[PDB]
Structure formats: C-alpha cells, structure tokens
Design a binder for this molecule. Sequence first.
Ligand SMILES: CCCC[C@H](CC)COC(=O)c1ccccc1C(=O)O
Ligand SMILES: CCCC[C@H](CC)CO
Length: 297
Amino acid sequence: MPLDPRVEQFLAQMPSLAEARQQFKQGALLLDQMVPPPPVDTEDGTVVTTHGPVRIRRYIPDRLRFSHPLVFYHGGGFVFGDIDTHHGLVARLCQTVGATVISVDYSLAPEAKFPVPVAECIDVARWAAHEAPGWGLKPSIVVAGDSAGGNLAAVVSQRAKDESLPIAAQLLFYPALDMVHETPSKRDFARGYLLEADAMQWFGEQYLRTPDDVSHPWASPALSPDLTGLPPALVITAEYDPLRDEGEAYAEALRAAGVPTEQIRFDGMIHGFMTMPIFPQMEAAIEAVARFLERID
Ligand SMILES: CCCC[C@H](CC)COC(=O)c1ccccc1C(=O)O
Ligand SMILES: CCCC[C@H](CC)CO
C-alpha cells in the first residue's frame, strides 16, 4: 500500500544525551503547536514504587464514560520522552474515551537500566488498581503504551496474574516485543522510516544490562510460551514500521490463545504516528481505542 501523502511529505522534509533528549522534546512541542491538544484537567503527583518515587499525571475527562482507569506508559526507546512529550496523545485518549488516565514518568535509561522501569510500571499499575474504587471506578485497569511504552504495557500485562494485579485490557501502539528475532519488517524497513536499526541498537545498549537481556521475558514478551488468560488486547501497527511484524505476530498469538484481540494495521503509516497529530490517522487510532474499550464492559 503506498505511503500516506502527508507521511511522504513529512519524511521528505525530515532533515550528547541531554541534547538529544531536548531535541526529541522540541520535536513534540512543534507538533503540538501545529495541532493543539484539547484542553483537559490534570493533577500532577508522585507514586512510591519499589525503585523510588515516580512522577505521574492524572487526566480527568470532561465526561466520565469508561469505568476503568487507564495507565499509560510513554514511548521513546526507554531513553527519551516524558509526560509532556506524550501529552498530545494522552489528552485525546482521556477526552475521546472519557476515561481517567494516569500517564507515567518512569525512569529512563541509561541512568536506570532494565528491568527497573518494568518494576516501576507494575508498581504504578498496582497503585492505580488500589486507588480506583476511591475514584468510583472499577479496580481493574487498562494499561497502554506506544513503542517502548507498548513493550512496558505488554510486560505488565504478562506479570499481572503473578503480581495479583487486575488488568481489564492492554492497548499496544506499535510496541517493541521481541529483541531476539529479526522479522521481515525489521529487515525491510530498517532505514528511512523515522525509527531505524542503528537507533534501536543504540537504544538496546542504553536499556539492557547485557546482550543476554534480549531473551529475558520482561524485555521480549513475545517469547512467552503461554499467553492464555492475558487481558483483552488492542494491537495497533503501522505498515512501514520495522516493529510491525513482531506486533502483528504477537496479536495472532494472543488470538490463538483465546484472548479477545483486535489487530489494526494503519496502511501507509510509520512508527510514532499516534504522537504525530499532523496525521489524521492519530485521531482515527484514538477512536479505535474508544470503540475497543466500549466492548470491555
Ligand atoms: C517558533 C518557531 C519554531 C522553530 C521551528 C524549527 C525549524 C521552525 O518553525 C516552524 O516552521 C514551525 C512553527 C510552529 C510549529 C511547527 C513548525 C515546524 O517546524 O513545522
Ligand atoms: C529497545 C528497542 C528494540 C531493541 C532491538 C530490537 C531488535 C534490539 O536491540
């Protein structure tokens, strides 16, 4: 399927650690200014985790129409991003679904290494489940994330059982799921579609303790042999994304394990598109999220 016209243009006009973090954040700013987010009530807070205090931001919708909190983990290769860089997405998730959303500022690599952010994300999910009844919501949460954050939501969902954590659904937006295998998509779209091989490698070096960590189930959830009884899954991929094939294979695996699964590929799109509000497909995907969550209760 051909590249989306606007994606094509965006890619055509595409030109230290702390610098690179600031540059990523600048990029998200320029997108937000091009396409402003909806206004939304938010409270900033801090959750006490087993690895320290983790800043969160709670989004409260104008109208509450979904009975479970969402816990959102931002993407950025485990190295970049924060609650601000992903505000544009979370505000829309909050207002379109009409859900409370907890956006999580988990600790970034290389300062924090795998598996520290997994622990933090589980702890925040556990906190949200506990608090939920106090907000007049159900205790079971929905976990959500893009890219690296989709990795985290996938892992938190696999741990859920064992950690006595009620999760009602998982929303995976072009997640990283398999750091061991090369897929066709990872081979064929390795360069020129915003997320590249070089970057993914460098990201892995920042995040992982050793090359052995790639086969760890908390790094590569796609390797887990028993997927039965995992939470209902929405898996959104981009057609021209190195990560596409691992995402779509994992959705196929969930489906065959009897998990209620929706798998949606956005044709002509690239990685990152759900934090790029210059593309209308970002809003279409957010509408997919709201329709999927309607079916949960
Ligand atoms: C204050 C100007 C920011 C600096 C940038 C950097 C080259 C150049 O400004 C623009 O072209 C621009 C402005 C607003 C939103 C998006 C953009 C844009 O880059 O697409
Ligand atoms: C952390 C981003 C993904 C890691 C990469 C995927 C094949 C391997 O190092």
